[PDB]
Write an enzyme that holds these catalytic residues in place. Structure first.
Site, mmCIF file in Angstrom:
data_model
loop_
_atom_site.group_PDB
_atom_site.id
_atom_site.type_symbol
_atom_site.label_atom_id
_atom_site.label_comp_id
_atom_site.label_asym_id
_atom_site.label_seq_id
_atom_site.Cartn_x
_atom_site.Cartn_y
_atom_site.Cartn_z
ATOM 1 C CG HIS A 22 71.694 3.009 -1.435
ATOM 2 N ND1 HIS A 22 71.704 3.857 -0.346
ATOM 3 C CD2 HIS A 22 72.769 3.346 -2.178
ATOM 4 C CE1 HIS A 22 72.731 4.676 -0.423
ATOM 5 N NE2 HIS A 22 73.401 4.384 -1.522
ATOM 6 C CG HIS A 29 73.507 8.643 -3.963
ATOM 7 N ND1 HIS A 29 72.937 7.615 -4.693
ATOM 8 C CD2 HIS A 29 74.396 8.062 -3.122
ATOM 9 C CE1 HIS A 29 73.450 6.459 -4.295
ATOM 10 N NE2 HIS A 29 74.290 6.699 -3.297
ATOM 11 C CB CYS A 64 83.053 3.598 0.890
ATOM 12 S SG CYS A 64 84.405 2.836 0.033
ATOM 13 C CG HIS A 66 76.195 7.598 1.305
ATOM 14 N ND1 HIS A 66 75.980 6.305 1.757
ATOM 15 C CD2 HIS A 66 76.163 7.532 -0.054
ATOM 16 C CE1 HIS A 66 75.775 5.505 0.722
ATOM 17 N NE2 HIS A 66 75.875 6.224 -0.393
ATOM 18 C CD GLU A 84 82.349 2.111 7.836
ATOM 19 O OE1 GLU A 84 83.340 1.921 7.071
ATOM 20 O OE2 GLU A 84 81.159 1.999 7.465
ATOM 21 C CE1 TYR A 101 79.652 2.089 -7.444
ATOM 22 C CE2 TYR A 101 80.528 4.294 -6.822
ATOM 23 C CZ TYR A 101 79.882 3.093 -6.479
ATOM 24 O OH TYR A 101 79.459 2.936 -5.157
ATOM 25 C CD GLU A 111 75.870 2.945 -3.263
ATOM 26 O OE1 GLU A 111 76.098 2.953 -2.053
ATOM 27 O OE2 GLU A 111 75.409 3.985 -3.854
ATOM 28 C CD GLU A 113 77.753 5.796 -3.798
ATOM 29 O OE1 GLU A 113 78.880 5.343 -3.921
ATOM 30 O OE2 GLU A 113 77.134 5.766 -2.717
ATOM 31 C CD1 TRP A 158 83.882 1.441 -3.167
ATOM 32 C CD2 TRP A 158 81.967 0.419 -3.831
ATOM 33 N NE1 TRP A 158 83.365 0.733 -2.093
ATOM 34 C CE2 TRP A 158 82.183 0.120 -2.476
ATOM 35 C CE3 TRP A 158 80.791 -0.075 -4.468
ATOM 36 C CZ2 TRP A 158 81.292 -0.715 -1.733
ATOM 37 C CZ3 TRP A 158 79.884 -0.890 -3.707
ATOM 38 C CH2 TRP A 158 80.159 -1.191 -2.366
HETATM 39 MN MN LIG Z 1 75.309 5.158 -2.169
#
Ligand SMILES: [Mn+2]
Length: 176
Positions: A22, A29, A64, A66, A84, A101, A111, A113, A158
């Site tokens: 990033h 990704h 959110c 990965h 989280e 986006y 970002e 993604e 996002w």
């Molecule tokens: Mn990312």
């Protein structure tokens, strides 16, 4: 932690270390987003901790992250929710599987993604992880969508982009 890299066909070409992927020139990704709702139908909005590298101190949808090698999208949602927010959720449901986006944060961190979107309901109490979440709120969905529509710069890109897709907003409303 890594991210899964993708080509223009959404085909995976490899993997890179989360932080280092990033940058100002972030390569396409894999990510996911989930919108979490309580038993009243309220959406959980969260504010990212001040310590996050990308969009620190920014309001955003519930969770959110990965997905990692070998993990489905759904399990990534379930695991990030436990990590989280300390919370259990119903089985994640697809709302916007083809969301993609690119955006730039106030420091120039990009970002970029392919980011399928889910909704789930919380089935236990929040136990907030302060290294990830600095603040949260339970809100009416329609209030959040008006905020997003009025002052989008007040939320993550996002969140805004997902919320503004017509099919995605309609499915999120139906879910509540
Ligand atoms: Mn990312």
């Amino acid at each position: 932690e890594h991210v899964i890299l993708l080509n223009a066909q959404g085909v995976p070409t490899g993997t890179l270390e989360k932080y280092a992927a990033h940058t100002a020139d972030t390569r396409l990704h894999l990510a996911f987003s989930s919108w979490l709702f309580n038993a009243k139908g309220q959406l959980l909005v969260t504010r990212r901790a001040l310590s996050k590298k990308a969009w620190p101190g920014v309001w955003t949808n519930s969770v959110c992250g990965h997905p990692q090698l070998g993990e489905s999208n759904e399990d990534a949602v379930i695991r990030r929710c436990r990590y989280e927010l300390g919370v259990e959720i119903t089985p994640p449901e697809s709302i916007y599987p083809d969301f993609r986006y690119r955006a730039t944060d106030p420091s120039g961190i990009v970002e970029n993604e392919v980011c399928p979107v889910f909704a789930a309901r919380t089935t236990s109490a929040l136990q907030i992880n302060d290294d990830e979440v600095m603040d949260y709120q339970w809100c009416d969905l329609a209030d959040v969508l008006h905020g997003i529509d009025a002052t989008p710069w007040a939320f993550s890109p996002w969140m805004v982009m997902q919320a503004t897709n017509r099919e995605a907003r309609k499915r999120l409303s139906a879910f509540t």
